[PDB]
Design a protein around this ligand. Structure first.
Ligand SMILES: Nc1ncnc2c1ncn2[C@@H]1O[C@H](COP(=O)(O)OP(=O)(O)O)[C@@H](O)[C@H]1O
Ligand SMILES: Nc1ncnc2c1ncn2[C@@H]1O[C@H](COP(=O)(O)OP(=O)(O)O)[C@@H](O)[C@H]1O
Lengths: 74, 353, 286, 87
């Protein structure tokens, strides 16, 4: 029952890694949002998201990471 | 405590880098598929082992690895602007009856739009081709924008408004493609409806050509033509068009097809203006003394908003006295006198057809 | 459960170089460490690992212990640097497991749902692909005895991905590669054939030796059924096996016919063109 | 020897907003837009919004703000100096 402080230490150490890898906001970007899951054709789970950039590029990424689909539509 | 570690384990999945978007162009062999980055370099890579090329096909939006660039995951359809043109909402519905006149403007547009949707058999019963669009114009009288706005939430079904402004897109005004990019979901979400205000300034003539910003205009027009010039059937989309004048559009638009029907508004009759004041006099409560024809016979040759706003302005001009309820006395003065000032700039409002 | 495991040369060397670690100080027993596996699917893959100091008394041949702080924070080290890596079990150098190796897996079953133990071999001798794989499972028995754990053998294969291929493929510097079609298949006919001879030979030598010495059980159980599976197919003709003979003869027809066709094409082109350029070079220069 | 320090001060970049003390977002004409921090030599209250600044584009720090913006030599043609032709 005393391991709650130990888990508090591992979430402080890993959130310290969230302080060094947030991962930091630097480059400005814009979003494109969608929901997906992969049946095959074995079965797995997950979700994806899309993004814009300041360099005009676009990327296909497993769902953010860090904050979630909570907000927003892009 | 445990949920925080869950968000930590969430972050243990996030160090994995996001892949690169891709469009599968065509294919060569099972290890080689023509693909291009959004920035233009074309590649041929291998797939992952779960997929069949029936799950890919040429001309398919996909994703690639960040190093091997291998085909892994995908989504068929995406875009930014589409749904964000949907969300404008008009109170009514019942605003249908709140536009006052006019019947053959009101009623015919129902037969022009509604019945095509529900009963295309009644088109093939006679054999007539379905009208795929509609056109308003003006502004004698007014209401071209609200009657649209009203019918959108009235007719219900699916409708998507086209904001006429941002299309120019600053750099590289090629955004006529976005109409296809919008038409593609109009072929997906079909049926769906489109209102367009201001087709005239995007109706550029290239009459006597000049400078630069006209060239991007006329080019953005060529697609609008070809999109309706198909090679395609847009019938499940209903294109509604209204603007200042139906003149500069050049004859390409002015023919049916692109412009399916001729509908417009004129100065509402004082008989119909008698009704336009009711929907103005409804939301305002006063002392019970009213003669509707008084303002109708005094105030003459106006528009619904012009009447209403000044009628409300009269109530606002009359409430300047700080008293609450106001008889038409002030209104038989204010609306009379105030609109006289408003009819000073009624000059030069009469435009070609 | 676990069907087959993929053992890279990196984990094997990671045990053997630790056999140099405690081998220079010696002496007896074996090299035991914690296995880091990667499970993408029913087929198991192995990438990295780490070894922990281990000692086992003989007195008391059933006494064993490992350092959990080493397993804990180093897993915290390797999971940190690589989030894909996790412990799928443990390993030891054998060569033959003593009966005490079961409880090691039973202790680390709290870490992983199923811990597969990998016996390895530091000194290559016989008979073939080294090491071994045993998965922890409860098979009970057909005799209805109280449930006991006899580890089932998991087939092990050697593979790599990219960089682990780069290192060893340059490190061979020994024998010709492959070469495809000539020496390859026939040396495999020697190895797989002859190592298959002495395999079942020594294995049938154990079949009779276990009946001669080592009873009980020993014999039972699987002896009668397994040996009858050996007696399933003798298997000779008559009849249809005679039909397969000249049918196989009819199969070699086409390929050897094609062989004579390549002979005519290769002889035509090469001989004609060479004699042309030969007689021409001689008559023009001479 | 004086080259290595201050040489990476590229690129001249205008800022956008500062939500709180540590954070800034800066925007350039290279198309690079970044929400990024400062070098400790720069105080928060001494800086203006939409201000051309120097930056080390590796960290994307705040090196120094530069007042000038536009305009090219048509100014320096229009802008004139020196005396002559007195009373
Ligand atoms: N009875 C009415 N009440 C309020 N607004 C009205 C009424 N009748 C017409 N309108 C206005 O007229 C607008 C469309 O006319 P438009 O041509 O855009 O105006 P204008 O003639 O001033 O250019 C509608 O958006 C609507 O707001
Ligand atoms: N058989 C026909 N003969 C002449 N015009 C037609 C015929 N069928 C359709 N049209 C009209 O031609 C228009 C499309 O013609 P198209 O050649 O694509 O336009 P554009 O010549 O501007 O490229 C439609 O609006 C339609 O009204």
């Amino acid at each position: 029952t005393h391991e709650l402080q130990a888990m508090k230490d591992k979430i402080k150490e890993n959130s310290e890694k969230i302080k060094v890898n947030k991962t930091l906001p630097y480059l400005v970007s814009n979003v494109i949002e969608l929901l997906d899951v992969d049946p095959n054709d074995s079965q797995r789970k997950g979700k994806c998201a899309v993004i814009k950039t300041s360099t005009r590029q676009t990327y296909f990424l497993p769902v953010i990471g860090l904050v979630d689909a909570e907000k927003l539509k892009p | 405590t445990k949920q925080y570690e869950k968000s930590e384990n969430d972050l243990k999945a996030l160090q994995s880098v996001g892949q690169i978007v891709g469009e599968v162009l065509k294919q060569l062999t099972e290890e080689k598929f023509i693909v291009k980055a959004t920035n233009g370099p074309r590649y041929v890579v291998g797939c992952r082992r779960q997929l069949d090329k029936s799950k890919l096909k040429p001309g398919t939006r996909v994703a690639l690895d960040m190093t091997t660039l291998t085909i892994m995951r995908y989504l068929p359809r995406e875009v930014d602007p589409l749904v964000y043109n949907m969300s404008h909402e008009d109170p009514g519905n019942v605003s249908y009856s709140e536009i006052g006149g006019l019947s053959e403007q009101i009623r015919e547009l129902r037969e022009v739009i509604e019945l095509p949707l529900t009963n295309p058999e009644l088109f093939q019963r006679v054999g007539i081709i379905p009208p795929k669009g509609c056109l308003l114009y003006g502004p004698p009288g007014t209401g071209k924008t609200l009657l649209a706005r009203a019918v959108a939430s009235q007719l219900d079904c699916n409708f998507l408004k086209v904001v006429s402004s941002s299309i120019v897109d600053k750099y590289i005004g090629e955004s006529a493609r976005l109409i296809r990019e919008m038409f593609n979901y109009a072929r997906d979400h079909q049926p769906c409806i489109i209102f367009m205000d201001e087709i005239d300034a995007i109706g550029g003539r290239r009459f006597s050509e000049g400078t630069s910003a006209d060239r991007e205009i006329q080019r953005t027009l060529m697609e609008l033509l070809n999109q309706m010039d198909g090679f395609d059937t847009l019938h499940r989309v209903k294109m509604i068009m209204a603007t200042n004048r139906p003149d500069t559009l050049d004859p390409a638009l002015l023919r049916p097809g692109r412009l399916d029907r001729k509908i417009h508004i004129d100065l509402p009759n004082e008989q119909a203006r008698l009704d336009i004041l009711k929907i103005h006099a409804g939301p305002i409560t006063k002392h019970g003394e009213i003669d509707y024809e008084a303002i109708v016979k005094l105030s003459d040759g106006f528009n619904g908003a012009d009447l209403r706003n000044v009628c409300t302005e009269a109530g606002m001009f009359a409430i300047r006295a700080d008293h609450d309820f106001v008889v038409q006395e002030d209104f038989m003065k204010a609306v009379r006198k105030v609109a006289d000032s408003k009819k000073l700039e009624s000059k030069l409002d009469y435009k070609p057809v | 459960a676990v069907q087959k495991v993929v053992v890279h040369p990196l984990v094997l060397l990671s045990v053997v170089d630790h056999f140099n670690r405690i081998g220079k100080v010696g002496n007896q027993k074996r090299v035991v460490g914690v296995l880091l596996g990667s499970w993408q699917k029913k087929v198991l893959d192995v990438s990295n690992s780490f070894a922990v100091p281990f000692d086992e008394d003989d007195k008391d041949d059933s006494v064993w212990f490992l350092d959990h702080d080493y397993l804990e924070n180093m897993y915290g080290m390797f999971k940190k640097v690589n989030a894909r890596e996790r412990i799928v079990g443990w390993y030891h150098t054998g060569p033959k497991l003593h009966k005490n190796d079961i409880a090691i897996n039973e202790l680390m079953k709290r870490y992983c749902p199923n811990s597969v133990l990998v016996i390895i071999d530091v000194k290559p001798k016989d008979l073939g692909l080294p090491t071994e794989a045993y998965i922890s499972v409860e098979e009970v028995h057909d005799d209805g005895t109280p449930t006991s754990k006899t580890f089932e053998h998991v087939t092990s294969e050697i593979g790599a991905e990219e960089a682990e291929e780069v290192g060893v493929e340059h490190l061979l510097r020994d024998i010709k590669d492959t070469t495809v079609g000539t020496l390859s298949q026939r040396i495999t006919n020697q190895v797989h054939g002859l190592k298959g001879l002495n395999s079942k030979l020594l294995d049938i030598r154990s079949y009779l030796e276990k009946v001669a010495t080592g009873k009980l059980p020993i014999n039972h159980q699987i002896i009668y059924q397994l040996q009858d599976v050996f007696n399933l197919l003798p298997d000779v003709s008559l009849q249809e096996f005679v039909k397969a003979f000249y049918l196989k003869t009819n199969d070699q027809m086409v390929v050897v016919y094609l062989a004579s066709l390549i002979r005519s094409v290769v002889a035509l082109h090469n001989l004609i063109n060479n004699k042309i350029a030969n007689r021409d070079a001689e008559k023009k220069e001479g | 020897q004086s080259e290595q320090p201050l040489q990476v001060a590229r690129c001249t970049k205008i800022i956008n907003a500062d939500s709180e003390d540590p954070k800034y977002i800066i925007n350039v004409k290279q198309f690079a837009k970044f929400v990024v921090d400062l070098s400790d030599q720069v105080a928060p209250t001494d800086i203006e919004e939409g201000m051309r600044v120097g930056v080390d584009r590796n960290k994307y720090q705040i090196h120094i703000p530069l007042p000038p913006k536009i305009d090219p030599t048509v100014t320096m043609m229009q802008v004139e100096e020196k005396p002559d032709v007195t009373y």
